[PDB]
Amino acid sequence: GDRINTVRGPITISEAGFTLTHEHICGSSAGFLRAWPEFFGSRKALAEKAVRGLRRARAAGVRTIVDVSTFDIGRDVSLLAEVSRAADVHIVAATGLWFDPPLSMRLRSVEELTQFFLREIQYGIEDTGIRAGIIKVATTGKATPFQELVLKAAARASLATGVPVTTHTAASQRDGEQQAAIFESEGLSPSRVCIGHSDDTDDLSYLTALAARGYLIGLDGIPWSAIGLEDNASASALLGIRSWQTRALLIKALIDQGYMKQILVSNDWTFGFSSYVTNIMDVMDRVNPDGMAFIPLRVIPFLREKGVPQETLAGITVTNPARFLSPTLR
Amino acid sequence: GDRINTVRGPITISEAGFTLTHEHICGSSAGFLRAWPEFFGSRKALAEKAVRGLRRARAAGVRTIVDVSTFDIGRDVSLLAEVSRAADVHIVAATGLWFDPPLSMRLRSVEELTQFFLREIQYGIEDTGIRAGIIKVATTGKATPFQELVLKAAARASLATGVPVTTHTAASQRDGEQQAAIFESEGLSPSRVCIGHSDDTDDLSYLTALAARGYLIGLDGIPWSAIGLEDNASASALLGIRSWQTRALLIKALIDQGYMKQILVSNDWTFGFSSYVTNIMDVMDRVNPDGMAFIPLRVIPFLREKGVPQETLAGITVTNPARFLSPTLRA
Ligand SMILES: CCOP(=O)(Cc1ccc(C)cc1)OCC
Ligand SMILES: CCOP(=O)(Cc1ccc(C)cc1)OCC
Ligand SMILES: [Zn+2]
Ligand SMILES: [Zn+2]
Ligand SMILES: [Zn+2]
Ligand SMILES: [Zn+2]
Ligand SMILES: [Zn+2]
Ligand SMILES: [Zn+2]
């Protein structure tokens, strides 16, 4: 409760400092990295790529990252522990389920799913003893019956442990609204939930509505933009055509309405990516060579240049995260 | 074509002995066993059960089993090795893809998949050095565009290595026919292919047509029957309501038509099963307490009893498999 679980062990809340709330070391699939490492060059190579990128973000002031990769995202905790130790960056691991669960998970009940999330948070991931510090869930527009179950089990495990919940949404379709509804029906406080991929929409009306309820708003894909890369149909589809400035501005808008306390910013960056078109990383790395350092290097100066007080900026990147991540029982 | 790859290393063809061609140590999902072993009691309990069952099969004469679990079936090669060693039964591992691929697989090209299968056969599984001795693929009725790629990649890897291909079909939909077409278009010889779940249809005309063309016919789920358990929907939907005898008789029927050399028999058994309803294992263990010994203990005697010469029985359980498994390069 006074401590947060990292892949290197528990840390005190003051030890977190500047935290990136939605990132990935690798975006893959369960067992993929162990079965076909060469798809990323090799395991060592992906590891070195990640350490370099984490060292650079650390130089920009980043002290902690929350890796929101779930079992189905192909999360490899041993890999997380190893790059964390090498780059000297704290990494918070996650439990929960994304939108590519295999049959062994899709056929489970809410009760069984609750047990699995609890196992990861209390006993540890696999046989490592490494505990999860957050629960990641997802909807892809209108919730499927299984997705519904996932949300309910995420909510029950949160209640029992104090651990927060972070989500993936189809912003455009106001997914946030349905998720809020389910979480509330389980008795979970909005304050323990972050509504993700929210910078993906321009609808300030949707956003302030959730903020007004106590939810945290995840503006985590700032550098995502295919402007110029309109050549590429795949990239255009994933990245979008809104510029990074446009996304960054959403931050200002919310602050302007009195919501600085409910904002969480991130890059939604990764060093490896197999669950997409081949070579999509190359494309991404071209669009954003700063990688995870983008927020500190480009978004912060930028917002300051627009009237946002530095002190306000420190609250969003240091204060908001600490409050969110500290394990809080009802 | 001298040696076959097992989880304990290469064996000579004469060492294979009585072989079960379509089995599983565990039926799961990639990464599941390592992430939630308690689902099976424990990984230790699972190993123990599996060792017991294999010793029982061994007591009955079984010397080798082919575990057709692919990556997406959650195949755990280290688990296989340990149980092989403890029970002293040879186990042949597989590469290929079944019907639950994750995004990282589903977005791959034919060229990309070829490389993954070759990796498993030549380089080995994961970092173990353990090499696959068969390629498993599947269709669930009419092939999806992804499935078609998988079949092409499997045909190409077989062509380069000489390792056989074994399939999963929706028998009632005559899936073997579309699979044959694809394989044939790739230049693959039918004798390198086993059309699985073939005991799931009563349509002998579909089976004889494939047999006539040179394909091997996998009558692999003999003990699967929901007979007397129709009070259970999930069970019945999976095991079917045709009796074990009905299935076994398809064996004699193909023999009677002159295709003994094209027949492969198995139990399609397992010691763990997470890719289905919870508790499915209990139901199965109720239905067939003999586990993988069912073939030797009940099917052989039954068949002998229906007039099949012992000699023919030996050909099917020893001979046919040795020929199918021998890595065979195209002339
Ligand atoms: C075997 C898996 O442990 P468990 O059942 C009970 C358990 C939880 C935490 C610790 C430290 C030990 C044991 O997990 C709780 C959901
Ligand atoms: C996994 C990297 O090995 P490779 O590229 C080439 C390779 C094949 C066999 C052996 C023994 C070593 C290396 O695998 C073939 C597809
Ligand atoms: Zn997402
Ligand atoms: Zn996002
Ligand atoms: Zn993400
Ligand atoms: Zn099958
Ligand atoms: Zn079968
Ligand atoms: Zn099978």
Give the H or E element holding residue A322.
Answer: helix A320-325
The single residue listed with the structure tokens 């999860």 is A132
Q: Which residues of B touch A28 (CB under 8 A)?
A: 104
Residues in chain A: 330
Taking only Cα atoms into account, the Rg of chain A, rounded to an integer number of angstroms, comes to 18
Tokens of residue A14, six digits: 């003051």
Give the per-residue SS3 of chain B. Answer: CCEEEEECEEEEHHHCCCEEEEECCCECCCCHHHHCHHHHCCHHHHHHHHHHHHHHHHHCCCCEEEECCCHHHCCCHHHHHHHHHHHCCEEECEEECCCCCCHHHHCCCHHHHHHHHHHHHHHCCCCCCCCCCEEEEECCCCCCHHHHHHHHHHHHHHHHHCCCEEEECCHHHCHHHHHHHHHHHCCCCHHHEEECCHHHCCCHHHHHHHHHCCCEEEECCCCCCCCCCCCCHHHHHHHCCCCHHHHHHHHHHHHHCCCHHHEEECCCCCCCECCCCCCHHHHHHHHCCCHHHHHHHHHHHHHHHCCCCHHHHHHHHHHHHHHHHCCCCCC
CA angle B28, B34, B39 (to 5 degrees): 60
The verdict on a CB contact (< 8 Å) between A29 and B119 is no
Tokens of residue B220, six digits: 């692999």
The single residue listed with the structure tokens 């079909």 is B169
Q: Are the C-beta atoms of residues A149 and A113 closer than 8 Å to each other?
A: yes
**Domain spans in chain A, listed from the N-terminal domain onward:** 1-330
A24 assigned binding-site residue: yes
Tokens of residue B172, six digits: 């009632």
Q: Which residues of A touch B102 (CB under 8 A)?
A: 29-30, 32, 72, 74, 100, 102, 275
B90 assigned binding-site residue: no
Q: Are the C-beta atoms of residues A220 and A267 closer than 8 Å to each other?
A: yes
- Cβ of B127 closer than 6 Å to ligand 1, yes or no, is no
Give the H or E element holding residue A313.
Answer: helix A310-314
Looking at the partner chain, which of B102, B109, B116 has a beta carbon nearest the beta carbon of A100? B102
- Cβ of B122 closer than 6 Å to ligand 2, yes or no, is yes
Q: Which of B80, B262, B90, B68 is nearest to B166 (CA)?
A: B68
Residues in chain B: 331
Task: List residues, by chain if needed, whose CB lies under 5 Å from ion ligand 7.
Answer: B 197, 220-221, 268
- Residue A178's identity, in one-letter code, is Q
User: Hey, how many other C-beta atoms are within 10 angstroms of the C-beta on B82?
Assistant: 17
Among chain B, residues having any CB pair with chain A shorter than 8 Å are 28-32, 34-36, 38-39, 71-72, 74, 100, 102-105, 107-109, 112, 116, 119, 125-127, 274-278
CA distances in angstroms from A223 to A53, B178, B201, B307, listed in the order given: 15, 46, 55, 74
Task: List residues, by chain if needed, whose CB lies under 5 Å from ion ligand 3.
Answer: A 168
Looking at the partner chain, which of B74, B104, B127 has a beta carbon nearest the beta carbon of A32? B104
The verdict on a CB contact (< 8 Å) between A104 and B38 is no
Q: Are the C-beta atoms of residues B151 and B184 closer than 8 Å to each other?
A: no
- Closest-approach residue (CA) in chain B for A116: B36
Give me the total of CB pairs closer than 8 Å, taking one residue from chain A and one from chain B: 89
Tokens of residue B43, six digits: 């990984």
User: Hey, how many other C-beta atoms are within 10 angstroms of the C-beta on A290?
Assistant: 18
Resolution in A: 1.9
Q: What is the CATH number of domain B1-331?
A: 3.20.20.140
Question: Spelled out in words, what is the top-level CATH class assigned to the domain A1-330?
Answer: alpha beta
